[PDB]
Amino acid sequence: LDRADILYNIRQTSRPDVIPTQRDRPVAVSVSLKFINILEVNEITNEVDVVFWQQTTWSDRTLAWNSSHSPDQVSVPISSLWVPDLAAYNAISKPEVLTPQLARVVSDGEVLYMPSIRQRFSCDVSGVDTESGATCRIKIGSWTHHSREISVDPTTENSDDSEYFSQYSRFEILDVTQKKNSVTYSCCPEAYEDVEVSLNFRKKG
Amino acid sequence: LDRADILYNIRQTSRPDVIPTQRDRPVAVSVSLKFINILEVNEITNEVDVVFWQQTTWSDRTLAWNSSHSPDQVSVPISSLWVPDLAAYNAISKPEVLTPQLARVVSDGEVLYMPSIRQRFSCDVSGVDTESGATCRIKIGSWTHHSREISVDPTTENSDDSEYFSQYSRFEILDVTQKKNSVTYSCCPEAYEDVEVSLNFRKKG
Amino acid sequence: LDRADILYNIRQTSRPDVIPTQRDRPVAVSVSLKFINILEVNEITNEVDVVFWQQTTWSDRTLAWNSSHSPDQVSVPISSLWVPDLAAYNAISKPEVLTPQLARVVSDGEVLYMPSIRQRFSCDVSGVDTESGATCRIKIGSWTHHSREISVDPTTENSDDSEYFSQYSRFEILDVTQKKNSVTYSCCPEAYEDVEVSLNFRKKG
Amino acid sequence: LDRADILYNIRQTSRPDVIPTQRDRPVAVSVSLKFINILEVNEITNEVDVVFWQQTTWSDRTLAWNSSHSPDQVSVPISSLWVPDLAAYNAISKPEVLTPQLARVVSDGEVLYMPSIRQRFSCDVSGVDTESGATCRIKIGSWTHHSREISVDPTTENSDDSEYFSQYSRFEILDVTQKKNSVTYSCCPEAYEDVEVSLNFRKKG
Amino acid sequence: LDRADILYNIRQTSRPDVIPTQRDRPVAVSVSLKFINILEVNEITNEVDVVFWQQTTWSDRTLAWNSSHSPDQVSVPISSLWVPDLAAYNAISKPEVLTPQLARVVSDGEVLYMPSIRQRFSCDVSGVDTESGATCRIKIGSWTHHSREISVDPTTENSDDSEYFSQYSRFEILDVTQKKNSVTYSCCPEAYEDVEVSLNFRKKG
Ligand SMILES: C[N+](C)(C)CCOC(N)=O
Ligand SMILES: C[N+](C)(C)CCOC(N)=O
Incomplete structure (x- = not known):
């Protein structure tokens, strides 16, 4: 199957509004923040x-295709896929998406989405000018x-x-824990899940 | 009836331009603000x-489905639902919606839409630096x-x-009454209803 | 008919690009600004x-319906209606519409669209700190x-x-004439009609 | 034809992606800037x-209709028309279009589109505080x-x-040449044409 | 074939979602930045x-047509073409596209897309006020x-x-290397190519 046929099939049948739940499993979404820059601090x-x-x-089995004589992966606009409705709870501005809004879809149905986002948050900035640094906690779910x-x-x-x-930021990263x-x-009576990202950073000497 | 079927049916037949009035009866819309942050004050x-x-x-009976062997709830893009045309009268900027624009629809037709909104208002900020605090009134209808x-x-x-x-705001909340x-x-000739939210708050000190 | 039928008919047949000229006559559009706030002055x-x-x-007879056993009025998205192409001539920013973009349509074809707008203007601010106040003229056509x-x-x-x-504005309104x-x-070879709105205001004392 | 028929026909058959070239001849686009305001200078x-x-x-013959017993002109959304892809070369912000995006189309196919635009430019501001004034050149093609x-x-x-x-600008216009x-x-070894607009202006006494 | 036919064919058959890969080989995208202005530096x-x-x-053979008695080139909205998902890695704002979003397509399938972009970057600004100048590196892939x-x-x-x-920028360009x-x-297991653009510039003086 070629790239065009795969993307046609996905566009024609994908249901961007339908969570790809399997029987009675939750959809296992993994989240991980890689920090590129710290631009302004107060x-x-x-x-x-x-x-x-x-x-x-995350996984969406409905996107899968037989990869026998076919590409292992394609890039797909996120508007043609179901995407988890993640939000950062302590954000104080909407996520400015810097990168093309394309996700990578593997033949088995895995979807990898990695946007670069600029966003402002309300968190603990105290001790930013210290050796210990500030510890800013970002909550996503x-x-x-x-x-x-x-x-x-x-x-x-x-991985580091x-x-x-950025080596050129005014700040440096001491530690990132998730x-x-x-x-x-x-x-609501149900439990909602989140990933807490702890950004321990400080102003450079 | 699985999730996909329910969302298809809702998308195909929802009449988002149509207030889901039952008989001569007003649509009962409940509104309640939970404050997350106070970011700037003047x-x-x-x-x-x-x-x-x-x-x-609120309630929209046209969304309802038989939940016998089906999910109790689904998440639905608000573009596929009728949503009350609520506005904040003393707002001085358009609501910046920070979260995914999805509402939660229950099988009996009840709808929860709970966006996080950043917005500026014109209201009484006098006494913000006092023990008594400022009392800022936000009017929504x-x-x-x-x-x-x-x-x-x-x-x-x-509740609290x-x-x-946010524990990290420069401000704290003394009281919130509705x-x-x-x-x-x-x-116009007719009466319009609103909810008045009184935010009694002050600078930490 | 019911609300759903009326809105369906309007959506299906309204011609948003078509000025509802009746016979050879102009569409009589009435415009009136009610000031809510004055936020910044220079x-x-x-x-x-x-x-x-x-x-x-204004009037659009093509929207009319028989109200015998039917609602007198419905709320309609402006994207489904013709709307006069009004512009504020001395505006120096685009109109920031703060409210839901719905107009109210009466069964005889009468439309009311009354958005709340934040917008900046170039006008006479001289004497804003005087008893006489500044007189800022806004032209709309x-x-x-x-x-x-x-x-x-x-x-x-x-209407006063x-x-x-807003009682909380730094400014107060002495007079509004239209x-x-x-x-x-x-x-251009033809006459263009405007409404000139004279906002006589001043800084409080 | 009435207004509705003319706008239907245009909407149905206009080809916005298609430059209305006649013969091997270029489409003659005329451009003229009328300055309304100068808001900020550095x-x-x-x-x-x-x-x-x-x-x-400009001219688009495909829009033409027989005006025997018909309106001479209609207003048409620019999304239903081909529009020249003009850009100001020395612009440093995207054009903020302040007015409704409607063009005027005459029965012979002439199209008059006069948006009001706020935009920032990089140009010669030297001597703005002089009698001679600054001469700021804007290039459009x-x-x-x-x-x-x-x-x-x-x-x-x-045209003056x-x-x-605006009589209320901090600045006044000495001369405008095109x-x-x-x-x-x-x-690229094909020629590209522009209109150069020279705005000779200065700060008021 | 005429311009209208060519643009119809492209619009009807272009697969904007589909990278125009030819065999298992990569699409050869060339990138070159021509600097127009440097507006703000910190x-x-x-x-x-x-x-x-x-x-x-870049090349997309599916866009090709027989140019025997036809135009050599057409301008085409980018929304009707596949476009490489290029991003500037060290950007800290989303690209503000200043120009009309049209690409030039040649009859053999070559495409040239050359938007004017305003964008902010995180890079080495040190020594901007020196003779040697700052060297700001922008990575694109x-x-x-x-x-x-x-x-x-x-x-x-x-080229140059x-x-x-702009001769009117506060800054001047000493050198650009790519x-x-x-x-x-x-x-990620696979290699990603980028073009590194080195902007050696300085404050005039
Ligand atoms: C509290 N929160 C944000 C995690 C869930 C809100 O529920 C909705 N939106 O249905
Ligand atoms: C006064 N107000 C804003 C509550 C109602 C305005 O009515 C409309 N928009 O039809």
């Missing part, structure tokens, strides 16, 4: 302006799907936290 | 910049549907008004 | 930043339809000037 | 912020069509320079 | 604000297509750098 207002790649991964529908997990972070970080929680809010 | 200009979740709830078509239910869950307010008004404006 | 640059409701009224196609007249000097004006001009510019 | 950065009407005129396809031309100019200029260039650049 | 934050023409060239699907090379180095640059890189990052 210790007084506890506000931070930040650029990061939001590595998002599904806005409308609870835990029986979307689970979110971090990945494993044994500064691997893609944990998950199941929270129960007063609007 | 006592001189009486302007406030604020992030809140606008918890909006239907822009074109009068009281025989849309009623607003101003009920508040009695700071359940999800009341309902019914107002005859000179433009 | 006496040096003669610039003003202002929030107002643009009460716009059709951008492409001349007087044999669109007439604009003001509405009703009844400060009727909806007047129809008819003008033959040198570019 | 002599240090050589940047200017300006509001002007960009009067654009087709971005992708060369001279055998689009010929850009300056219109007639009995400050005919429509001339035509035909540059063959180093990449 | 040596403290290492941020730059820049206007450039992003000359992008495909965001989702690796090196077996997209190659990127600079266009050939006979200052030829299009080199190509192929780089495997730890996030």
Whole structure:
């Protein structure tokens, strides 16, 4: 099957509005932030302006194709795919997507989406000018799907936290840790899941 | 009836331009603001910049499905649903919607849309640096549907008004009260309902 | 008919690109600005930043329905209606529409569209800090339809000037007067009609 | 034909992607800027912020209709028409179109599109505070069509320079001249044409 | 064939979603930045604000037509073509496209798309006020297509750098060099090609 046929099939049958739930599994969404830049920081207002790649991964079996004499992967506009409705709860501006809105789809149905996002957050900026640094916590989860529908997990972070970080930022990254929680809010009786990203950073000497 | 079928049926037959009035009866729309952040304040200009979740709830029986062996709920893009034309009257900027534009639809036809919104308002900022604090009143109602078509239910869950307010804001919340008004404006003959949200807050100190 | 049928018929047959000229006569469009706020003023640059409701009224007989056993009125997305191409001539920013883009349509074909608009203007700000106040003149008319196609007249000097004006603005309204001009510019061969809105205001003391 | 029929026909058959070339002849596009305002000036950065009407005129014979017992002219959304791909070469912001995006089409096929545009430019601001004034040159031409396809031309100019200029601007207009260039650049060995608009202006006493 | 026919065929059959891969070989995309302006510079934050023409060239054989008695070239909206998903890696704002979104298509299938872009970057601004100048490096490559699907090379180095640059900028260009890189990052198993553009510039003085 060629690239054109795969993308035709996906465009014609994909249901961007349908969570690709399988029987009674939640859709396992993995989330991992790779920080590229820290552009503006305010210790007084506890506000931070930040650029990061939001590595998002999940499975959608309906996109799958037989890769016998066919490409293993294609790039697909996200408007033709179901995409998890992730939001950053402590964000104070809408995500400015810097990169083309294309996801990578593998023949088995895996979807890799990695937009570069600039976004401002309300978090702990105290101690940014210290050796210990500030620890800014960014919380990301599904806005409308609870835990029986979307689970979110971090990945494993044994590649350099500064691997893609800008050497020319005023700031440097001491540490990045990722944990998950199941929270129960007063609007709704079900538990919603999130990945908490801890950005320990500081102003350069 | 699986998720895909329900969302197909809703997309195909939902009449998003059509207020889901039942008989002579107004659509009962409940509104409740949960404040997340207070980002900028100006006592001189009486302007406030604020992030809140606008918890909006109503009934549309045309969305309903038999939930016998089916999901109790689905998430649906708001473009495929009728949504109340709520507006904040004392808003001085258009609502910046920070979250995915998806509503939660229950099998009996109840709809929860809970966007996170950043928006600026013109309101009483006097006494923001006092113990008593400022009391900033935000008025929300239907822009074109009068009281025989849309009623607003101003009920508040009695939890911390700071359940999800940012501990890192320069400001803190003393109190949040909600009341309902019914107002005859000179433009038109009929009364329009609103919810008045009183945000009593102050600078930390 | 019911609300759904009326809205279907309007959506299916309304011709948004078509001025609802009746016989050989101009469409009589009435325009009236109700000022809500004055947010920023600069006496040096003669610039003003202002929030107002643009009460716009006109007739479109093609939208009419028999209201015998039917609703007198419905709310309709403006994208499904012809709307006069009004522009504020001395505007220096595009109109930021703050409210839902719905117009109210009466069974006889009468339309009311009354968006809340934030917009900046170039006008006389001199004397803003005086007792006499500044007098800022805003001109509004059709951008492409001349007087044999669109007439604009003001509405009703009844409603108080400060009727909806924010008590929390730094400024107060002394007087609002509205007047129809008819003008033959040198570019074009026909008369264009406008409404001139004179906002006499000042800084509070 | 009535107005509705003419606009239906245009909408149904207009080919917005298709330059209305006749023969091997270029489409004669005339361009003329009428300055309304000069809002911000910086002599240090050589940047200017300006509001002007960009009067654009051209012929599209495919739009023509028999005007025997029919209107001479209609207003048409520019999305239903081919429009020349004009760009200001020395622009440093995208054109902010302030007015409704409607062109005027005459029964013989002439199309008059006069949007009001706010846009910033990089040009010579030196001597703005002098008697002689600054002379800011704005260059406008087709971005992708060369001279055998689009010929850009300056219109007639009995028209007064400050005919429509704001009396309330900090600045005044001494002179506005328009001339035509035909540059063959180093990449591409086909000629590209522009209209150069020279805005001689200064700060008021 | 005439212009209308060519554009119809392209619109009807172009597969904008489909990389025009020929055999298992990569689409050879050439990229070359021509700097028009440098608008704002910050040596403290290492941020730059820049206007450039992003000359992008590539082949799509599916767009080809027989040019025997037909035009050699047409202009085509990019929404009707596949376009490489290029992104500037060190950008900190989304590309503000200043120009009309049209690409030039040649009868053999060559495509030249050359938008003018304003964009901000994070790069080395140190020494901007020196004789040596600052050297700001901008990296551009495909965001989702690796090196077996997209190659990127600079266009050939006979052309010029200052030829299009604004004489009125506060800054001047000393040198522009373009080199190509192929780089495997730890996030992803495949190599991604980029073009690195080195902008050596300085403040006039
Ligand atoms: C509280 N929250 C944001 C996690 C879930 C809100 O529920 C919706 N939107 O249906
Ligand atoms: C006064 N107000 C805004 C509540 C209602 C305006 O009515 C409309 N838009 O038809």
